[PDB]
Design a protein around this ligand. Sequence first.
Ligand code: GDP
Ligand code: MG
Length: 167
Amino acid sequence: NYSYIFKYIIIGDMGVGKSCLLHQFTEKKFMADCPHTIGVEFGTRIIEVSGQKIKLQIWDTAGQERFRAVTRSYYRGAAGALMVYDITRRSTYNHLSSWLTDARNLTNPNTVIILIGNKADLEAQRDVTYEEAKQFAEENGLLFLEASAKTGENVEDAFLEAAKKIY
Ligand SMILES: Nc1nc2c(ncn2[C@@H]2O[C@H](COP(=O)(O)OP(=O)(O)O)[C@@H](O)[C@H]2O)c(=O)[nH]1
Ligand SMILES: [Mg+2]
């Protein structure tokens, strides 16, 4: 049961963990025994926000908004956007202005955007600081969390904090 529907997109460079973040949230598990599959594209989950029951739809959109009319309008009705980079890979951080442009250009003026730095579990291999990403987020009025799709650290919060701001 639910009283509202929130559409989410999840975007960012290939291999940053978009499919894993979506899977960890909807199914509460990290695979590790299934490296041979493509990686989950879509999912849903009912959450409780501010005393309300809300259904979240989540789409690893993969740039299909340029080709598919239905993907085009889902994008235009997006309530939230997770913009994801890989903390161990600076190039994924460097492409954020491009992803932010797409996001804003192709959604609607209400769309709430959250920045996620994924793979926080790989501490020894950190390539991007918390501090620089926090300043990018603050400049652009985004929410910001460092998270780990593998361990589940801050993954629930990622989706829930966005939803509470959507009100
Ligand atoms: N260590 C670690 N590996 C991850 C994490 N999230 C994803 N991966 C791995 O990164 C690779 C790409 O993940 P995937 O979700 O398919 O990336 P996508 O292309 O953005 O959807 C896979 O081999 C995952 O097992 C994480 O939080 N920590
Ligand atoms: Mg994927």
